[PDB]
């Protein structure tokens, strides 16, 4: 699966567990990126960025 965390994932993208539980929406703005810890959260398995 993917390797990201809620901090580093992108605003506009939702991150989910392998069972389909919504974990968080990403917090980073591609244009004005914030500093985040760089581990892979064990709970996020995939994401969907609704369009």
């Amino acid at each position: 699966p993917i390797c990201t965390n809620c901090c580093a994932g992108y605003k506009g993208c939702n991150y989910y567990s392998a069972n389909g539980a919504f974990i968080c929406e990403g917090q980073s703005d591609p244009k004005k990126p914030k500093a985040c810890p760089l581990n892979c959260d064990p709970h996020i398995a995939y994401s969907k960025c609704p369009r």
Binding site: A35, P37, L38, C40, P42
Partner: protein, 185 residues
Amino acid sequence: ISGGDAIYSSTGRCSLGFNVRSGSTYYFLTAGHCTDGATTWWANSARTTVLGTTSGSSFPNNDYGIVRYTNTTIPKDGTVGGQDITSAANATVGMAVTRRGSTTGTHSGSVTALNATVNYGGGDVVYGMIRTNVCAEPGDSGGPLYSGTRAIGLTSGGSGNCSSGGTTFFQPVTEALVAYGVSVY
């Protein structure tokens, strides 16, 4: 296994910082945010090859952690991939440095500031960080920052990525070596 290789635990996946020792006892250093709440570490995503158990963790404020090896057979090279490590040093602005991590591999840059304060949000603030213009991505946490054969730091956090460029923060390694009474080799 060496600096920059993947390490897995209940806390997720991070990168090994440096292989260190105390006499004849071996450990590895990694980020404190990765060791915080982890117990056993494995070398593979299947989590069938044991590495060791967490022995110390300091995060936030600092960002360092140590794991005691319990696996007697795995090679514990005192290197970063191919690069041999012989000693530890303090960063200086302008120092040419390279980082290795399990997500992005090896990337180079320089130290641009010392003693940076970084707010990760949610009440997690770290102090005394080394600021660089080297990129890193999730999974890279805990990976080594080095200069030639000198060990300099452990990847703590950053913004941006290895495709567009980023800023990366590192915990000086000297501080963790002193805190645990261990050395690189």
